[PDB]
Amino acid sequence: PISPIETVPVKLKPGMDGPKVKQWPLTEEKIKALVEICTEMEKEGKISKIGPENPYNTPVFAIKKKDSTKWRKVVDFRELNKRTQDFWEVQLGIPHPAGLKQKKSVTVLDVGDAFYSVPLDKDFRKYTAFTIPSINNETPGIRYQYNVLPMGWKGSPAIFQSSMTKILEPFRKQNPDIVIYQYMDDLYVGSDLEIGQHRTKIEELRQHLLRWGFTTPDKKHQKEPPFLWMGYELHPDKWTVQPIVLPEKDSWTVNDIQKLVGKLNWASQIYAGIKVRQLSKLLRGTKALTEVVPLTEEAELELAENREILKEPVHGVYYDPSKDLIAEIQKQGQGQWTYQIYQEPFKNLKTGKYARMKGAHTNDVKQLTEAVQKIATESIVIWGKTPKFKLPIQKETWEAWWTEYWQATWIPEWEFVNTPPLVKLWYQLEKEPIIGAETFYVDGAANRETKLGKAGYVTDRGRQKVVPLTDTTNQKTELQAIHLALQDSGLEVNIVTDSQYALGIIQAQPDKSESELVSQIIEQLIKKEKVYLAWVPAHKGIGGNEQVDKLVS
Amino acid sequence: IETVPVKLKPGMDGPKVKQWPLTEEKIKALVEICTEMEKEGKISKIGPENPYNTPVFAIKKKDSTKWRKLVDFRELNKRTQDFWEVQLGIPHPAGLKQKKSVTVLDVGDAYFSVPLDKDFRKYTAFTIPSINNETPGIRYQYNVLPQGWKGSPAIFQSSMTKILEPFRKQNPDIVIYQYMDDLYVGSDLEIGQHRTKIEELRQHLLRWGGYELHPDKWTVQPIVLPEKDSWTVNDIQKLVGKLNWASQIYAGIKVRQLSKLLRGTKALTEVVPLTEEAELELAENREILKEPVHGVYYDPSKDLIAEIQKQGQGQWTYQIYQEPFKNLKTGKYARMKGAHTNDVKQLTEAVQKIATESIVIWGKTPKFKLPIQKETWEAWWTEYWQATWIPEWEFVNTPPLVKLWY
DNA sequence: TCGCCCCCCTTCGGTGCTTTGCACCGAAGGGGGGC
Ligand SMILES: Nc1nc2c(ncn2[C@H]2C[C@H](O)[C@@H](COP(=O)(O)OP(=O)(O)OP(=O)(O)O)O2)c(=O)[nH]1
Ligand SMILES: [Mg+2]
């Protein structure tokens, strides 16, 4: 059936015309698959025969459906899509089973031939012209246009979703205590009514849908747990992901590793402690998806750990609005973080992970804050509120950070949880100079034209050094001058630089960095006992600074 | 009524900005506000064939604990034609900053009685999200002058003058200035007498359709130099680097006879006696910092910029300028909620206060340079926003070299 | 040989700075998952 709902008016982008691209050859099995779909689509009014007055064309093909017997007709509208107006997409995100509440009666329904039940704007139909080949040359193919939403057109999903929202709105308004999760044409319907009254409401919803042209075939009509929904299995008390099968290969290509990492990220939503840093590093610097990449030892270990996690059964629970949300985070090493969101202990709603490297230089406290922010955003999306946090960072560590760090920062209500390794600052810089400690005046300079440079220092105890540097930069020289002062000094030091750049990096107390030079400076800062670091402007003849500025010349 | 023809600036398209996630209580407030607005025909439900979008959220001032819908039309305003070109703009009275008390009124509802150009309505679309994406977003567009749109005070202006003429005739000494959805209304009356005539202005409005500021206490915080009895090498290179930086703002500031009082490669903790020729240079520069800079004047043709530095213990310094190092105003913001522990709330409140001062003083808000990570700001700032306008901002990570402003 | 959505990890290129590389950030490549 075709919905009597009003068509949505759609336009081509200004100055553009329609697509004119020839059909390609296809197999006999797919030609008769399409002839069966097409001649029956014409009898249902989904398409109409067109002639030469219509100059447009676009190629069509067919792919299999998860129910193996059925075929899906699909059109390669890439050209028409480019020329079609933009849309504002109404699908804002993906519903998650951890956001569902427990319901006494649950149904899952699916609309049959959903896109084909929504009419297409009449003035637009001529641009959907296509041709079914039929063994390619015994005949010039038969030509049709769509009267309904085609699969493969850029506008079809949003127009369907918007139309489905309009059709459902009268039923939702009349039935506020029935939850209808609406994802494309898939409808999850939960209620606290007894099964008898629930089925009454379902028949009423199905009849309402049918009067608007939306069938709900019995094949796609689930009434008994477990419900198959959005890639999950819904039980009354719990939910699971549908089985995740990891690729198992003797030789791995780039593309295989890419699929493995993706499967693992998907699993990380309910399997705690998944890691993908070492497998992901294997993708860096590769140049072809078919390039063979040997697994490093670290990636094999990571893979083996993930496989042990994946063999154990897991389940999520459903959301209880009357209880707090709690998010707990653990540090895993090398900028990797894993978390669990629960309301009652040892009953996770869902899990996840955070492992992005943001910025060239950072520290664990910053990354913990990023994890907190990711979890906060995800909880707003799924539950509409943020959770209480349990974090492996002492309250004094945090307070030391947000007072000596010059940017505003914050973490919401959180509780310390002692799950080592704890998040900590790996060194602090003295607010005042240190009595009895050596004073280094450092400087470096490089020649931008010749990439040759020099780094060195002078000292109040009369110590001076100068090192030549090849293939450097202006900024690298200054980092090197600090490198050497830390290298040649005792446990307590006072350092004076004229590099705002270098001071800026070190003052933020980074504990890791994409640069090996900064990495080395960090290791030396961590080994020191006290370090005061001070700045003065360059090329103004200031005592100590001017002397080392002269020496590096 | 007949609508005013409105256009975007040449070569520009409408806003296309994604809706961000909303808490449950903001979504429910929006659903009830928008449903009611739709019944009254101020907005219409639209579909995805309108390709434009602007984020929507909601705020709740607590000493008026009902929700206020806030659409972030900052993008649409940047792309909307100027009404200065159409000569429909509002002028700013120079007397408002002279008043001792200024009350802010939200008059955004007056716009809803004027229809919007039918060809412009599509640019005002917004989308209400859905908890756990239970549904697709629900889309609306305005049929009337929207709150927060640059064009609404301009189109409504002559109507606003007719509404206010009887009140400012009866009160020639009170100054009222419209900025977007707000009226800034200043007077010199006793605090309870000021509030009484605010309530009279409110009810002359209710017949057609905040807290007290004080311009009188917005102290300017100058660059200060430390006062000690004895001075280390470190104290003096911290003082010289600070003055060398101030030499870009002030005129005739020298460090030559303090520069090389640090002569030689000396220890940072070594006490250096001040020469008579350094005490001479120090107090001279100290005065030059006591009196304001000569030659800095506001230019209404240019945007205002605001910088903020976090100083600690709830203290926040700020400068407002249009050209680098020519500060029209320097200041210091301090707050004590009593919780004592939210940097993002403090910065968000500092931004509203500074922006409010620019409205009172110059009639527009500055573009803020915010000392915060973009993602930290965006995780939380709407939880603390209480104004009906939103200023422009960007994010900067500038480590302090000098502590110039403290 | 198709479409729309969210997620993560890598790569690339535009922007602005009182720069000469550098750090930041958005977009596009790959992958997962949904219909
Ligand atoms: N262009 C395109 N659209 C798809 C695809 N898969 C699903 N959709 C869209 C179009 C479908 O009509 C809609 C619902 O997906 P279904 O698998 O339920 O297919 P449909 O309802 O049309 O047929 P059905 O009777 O349920 O087997 O979602 C796809 O692979 N390509
Ligand atoms: Mg279907």
CB–CB of A435/A537 below 8 Å?
no
Residue range(s) defining the domain that contains residue B77? 5-94+120-160
Residue range(s) defining the domain that contains residue A267? 254-311
Q: What are the respective helix, strand and coil percentages of chain A, to the nearest 5?
A: 30, 25, 45
Evaluate whether residue A10 is within a structural domain.
no
Structure token pair of residue B109? 């509802």
Q: Tell me the three state secondary structure of residue B375.
A: helix
Structure token pair of residue B234? 């470190």
Alpha carbon nearest to ligand 1 atom 25, residue? A112
* Partners of B306 in the β-ladder: B320, B368
Give the span between the Cα atoms of B67 and B311, in whole angstroms. Answer: 33
- B234 at A interface, C-beta within 8 A: yes
How would you class A321 by CB atoms within 10 Å of its CB: exposed for 0-12, middle for 13-18, buried for 19 or more? exposed
Q: Tell me the three state secondary structure of residue B43.
A: strand
Q: What are the respective helix, strand and coil percentages of chain B, to the nearest 5?
A: 35, 20, 45
Same domain, B395 and B350: yes
Sorted by sequence, the CB contacts under 8 Å of residue B137 that are 6+ apart come out as A90, A91, A92, B19, B127, B128, B129, B130
Match 């009611």 to its residue by tokens.
B36
CB–CB of A62/A204 below 8 Å?
no
Q: Report the residue of A410, A435, A464, A499 to disrupt the B interface, i.e. the one with the largest count of B CBs within 10 Å.
A: A410
Same domain, B291 and B246: yes
Evaluate whether residue A537 is within a structural domain.
yes
Same domain, B100 and B147: no
CA A111–ligand 2 middle distance (angstroms): 4
Tally of domains within chain B: 4
Phi, psi of A100 (to 5 degrees): -75, 145
Give the span between the Cα atoms of A103 and A325, in whole angstroms. Answer: 19
In the Cβ-directed half-sphere of A371, how many Cα atoms lie within 13 Å?
29
Same domain, A301 and A330: no
CB–CB of A3/A163 below 8 Å?
yes
Give the span between the Cα atoms of A69 and A205, in whole angstroms. Answer: 29
Q: Tell me the three state secondary structure of residue A286.
A: coil
Structure token pair of residue A349? 């709603």
Q: Characterise B87 by phi-psi region: left (phi > 0), alpha (psi -120 to 50), beta (else).
A: left
Closest CA to B137 of A189, A3, A88: A88
Structure token pair of residue A499? 């590099």
Chain centroid to CA B143: 28
Evaluate whether residue A105 is within a structural domain.
no
Neighbours of B400 (CB within 10 A): 18
Measured in Å, how far apart are chain B's first and last C-alpha atoms? 56
Report which DSSP code applies to A342.
Answer: E
Nearest 5°: the CA angle B239, A498, A426 is: 100
Same domain, A448 and A543: yes
B49 and A462: CB-CB below 8 Å?
Answer: no
Closest CA to B178 of B255, B240, B88, B257: B88
Count of positions (residues) in chain B = 406
Same domain, B352 and B378: yes
Give the span between the Cα atoms of A464 and A467, in whole angstroms. Answer: 11
Is residue B331 within a helix (H) or strand (E), and if so which, with residue range? strand B327-334
Same domain, B222 and B167: no
Select from B189, B212, B235 the last residue of a domain. Answer: B212
Nearest 5°: the CA angle B236, B240, B244 is: 175
Closest CA to B68 of B350, B358, B382, B299: B382
**Which pairs count as long-range contacts for A375-381, CB under 8 Å and 24+ apart, including other chains?**
A375/A327, A375/A329, A375/A339, A375/A341, A376/A412, A376/B379, A377/B21, A377/B379, A378/A352, A379/A325, A379/A327, A379/A341, A380/B21, A380/B22, A380/B23, A381/A93, A381/B21, A381/B132, A381/B133
Structure token pair of residue A197? 């009254």
In A257-379, where do the E strands start and end?
A: 326-333, 336-344, 347-354, 361-362
CB–CB of A96/A382 below 8 Å?
yes
Match 């804050």 to its residue by tokens.
A369
In single-letter form, the type of residue at position B320 comes to I
Pocket of ligand 1 (CB under 6 A): A 74, 110-115, 151-152, 184-185, 220
Same domain, B264 and B365: no
Same domain, A280 and A350: no
Same domain, A443 and A540: yes
Binding site as annotated, residues of B for Mg(2+)? 106, 181-182
Evaluate whether residue A305 is within a structural domain.
yes
Report which DSSP code applies to A142.
Answer: E
Give the span between the Cα atoms of B98 and B255, in whole angstroms. Answer: 39
Query: What is the 3-class SS of A473-522, one letter each residue?
Result: CHHHHHHHHHHHHHHCCCCEEEEEECCHHHHHHHHCCCCEECCHHHHHHH
In single-letter form, the type of residue at position A84 comes to T
Q: What is the CATH number of the domain that holds B382?
A: 3.30.70.270
- A489 at B interface, C-beta within 8 A: no
CB–CB of A148/A117 below 8 Å?
yes
Closest CA to B188 of B106, B105, B96, B104: B96
In single-letter form, the type of residue at position A356 comes to R
In single-letter form, the type of residue at position A397 comes to T
Strand order in the sheet with A438-447: A465-470, A452-459, A438-447, A492-497, A530-535
The residue that minimises its CA distance to C1' of C8 is: A265
Give the span between the Cα atoms of B288 and B282, in whole angstroms. Answer: 10
Closest CA to A444 of A484, A488, A477: A477
Query: What is the 3-class SS of A163-214, one letter each residue?
Result: HHHHHHHHHHHHCCCEEEEEECCEEEEEECCCHHHHHHHHHHHHHHHHHCCC
CA dist list (Å): B22 to A178, A375, B26, B329, B392: 22, 14, 6, 36, 21
Same domain, A304 and A330: no
Same domain, A546 and A447: yes
CA dist list (Å): A69 to A43, A64, A65, A186, B393: 22, 8, 7, 20, 57
Measured in Å, how far apart are chain A's first and last C-alpha atoms? 85
Closest CA to B177 of B94, B70, B112: B94
CB–CB of A318/A291 below 8 Å?
no
Closest CA to A528 of A486, A496, A500, A494: A486
Same domain, B258 and B240: yes
Across chain A, how many H-helices and E-strands are there?
Answer: 13, 23
Peptide bond into B324 cis (omega under 30): no
Give the span between the Cα atoms of A500 and A42, in whole angstroms. Answer: 73
CB–CB of A481/A443 below 8 Å?
yes
Which nucleotides on chain C have any atom < 7 A from a protein Cβ? 1-11, 18-26, 30-35
Phi, psi of A484 (to 5 degrees): -75, -35
Give the span between the Cα atoms of B293 and B394, in whole angstroms. Answer: 27
Same domain, A446 and A540: yes
Give the span between the Cα atoms of A512 and A518, in whole angstroms. Answer: 8
Give the span between the Cα atoms of A56 and A130, in whole angstroms. Answer: 8
Is residue A120 within a helix (H) or strand (E), and if so which, with residue range? none
CA A114–ligand 2 middle distance (angstroms): 5
Same domain, A291 and A331: no
Strand order in the sheet with A178-183: A105-110, A186-191, A178-183
Same domain, B127 and B80: yes
CB–CB of B312/B329 below 8 Å?
no
Same domain, A279 and A349: no
Phi, psi of A216 (to 5 degrees): -135, 85
CB–CB of A56/A126 below 8 Å?
yes
- Within 8 A of A86 by CB-CB distance, chain B residues are 16, 51
Closest CA of chain B from A145, distance in Å = 21
Q: What is the CATH number of the domain that holds B10?
A: 3.10.10.10
Neighbours of A336 (CB within 10 A): 21
- A370 at B interface, C-beta within 8 A: yes
Sorted by sequence, the CB contacts under 8 Å of residue A66 that are 6+ apart come out as none
Evaluate whether residue A527 is within a structural domain.
yes
Q: Tell me the three state secondary structure of residue B341.
A: coil
Q: What is the DSSP string of A382-447?
A: HHSSPPEEEESB-HHHHHHHHHHSSS-----SEEE---SSPB--S----SS--TT-EEEEEEEEEE
B135 and A370: CB-CB below 8 Å?
Answer: no
Chain centroid to CA B77: 16
Same domain, B220 and B267: yes
Sorted by sequence, the CB contacts under 8 Å of residue B114 that are 6+ apart come out as B1, B3, B144, B145, B152, B155, B156, B159
Q: What is the DSSP string of B55-91?
A: -EEEE--GGG-S-EEEE-THHHHHHBPPTTTTT-PPP
**Nearest neighbour of B399 by CB, restricted to A90, A406, A548:** A406
Same domain, A287 and A332: no
* Partners of A400 in the β-ladder: none
Closest CA of chain B from A363, distance in Å = 14
Residue A94 (CA) to nucleotide C34 (C1'), in angstroms, measures 7
The nt closest to A89 (CA vs C1′) is C4
Neighbours of B86 (CB within 10 A): 15
Q: Tell me the three state secondary structure of residue B274.
A: coil
Select from B298, B323, B348 the last residue of a domain. Answer: B298
Give the span between the Cα atoms of A284 and A297, in whole angstroms. Answer: 16
Strand order in the sheet with B138-142: B43-46, B138-142, B126-128
Pairing of strands B175-179, B315-321: unpaired
Structure token pair of residue B74? 């900052």
Structure token pair of residue A76? 């390669």
Select from B212, B229, B250 the last residue of a domain. Answer: B212
Same domain, B11 and B152: yes
Nearest 5°: the CA angle B167, B172, B175 is: 80
Chain centroid to CA A179: 27
Structure token pair of residue B140? 């609306």
* Resolution (Å units): 2.3
Evaluate whether residue A99 is within a structural domain.
no
The residue that minimises its CA distance to C1' of C18 is: B324
Tally of domains within chain A: 3
Give the span between the Cα atoms of A93 and A115, in whole angstroms. Answer: 20
* Partners of B394 in the β-ladder: B369
Strand order in the sheet with A347-354: A347-354, A336-344, A326-333, A388-391, A414-416
Same domain, A362 and A337: yes
Select from A416, A447, A477 the last residue of a domain. Answer: A416
Match 């922010």 to its residue by tokens.
A373
Chain centroid to CA A45: 41
Nearest 5°: the CA angle A107, A112, A118 is: 120
CA A188–ligand 2 middle distance (angstroms): 13
**Nearest neighbour of B241 by CB, restricted to A8, A435, A537:** A537
Give the span between the Cα atoms of A141 and A131, in whole angstroms. Answer: 6
Give the span between the Cα atoms of A416 and B7, in whole angstroms. Answer: 55
- B375 at A interface, C-beta within 8 A: yes
Alpha carbon nearest to ligand 1 atom 29, residue? A151
Q: Tell me the three state secondary structure of residue B356.
A: helix
Q: What is the CATH number of the domain that holds A493?
A: 3.30.420.10
Give the span between the Cα atoms of A459 and A547, in whole angstroms. Answer: 10
- A345 at B interface, C-beta within 8 A: no
Structure token pair of residue A53? 């007055």
* Partners of B105 in the β-ladder: B183
Evaluate whether residue A237 is within a structural domain.
no
- Within 8 A of B132 by CB-CB distance, chain A residues are 95-96, 99-100, 381-384
Same domain, B55 and B105: no
Neighbours of A208 (CB within 10 A): 15
Neighbours of B210 (CB within 10 A): 16
Same domain, B189 and B237: no
Give the span between the Cα atoms of B311 and A543, in whole angstroms. Answer: 29
How would you class A375 by CB atoms within 10 Å of its CB: exposed for 0-12, middle for 13-18, buried for 19 or more? buried
Structure token pair of residue A511? 């504990």
Give the span between the Cα atoms of A503 and A536, in whole angstroms. Answer: 11
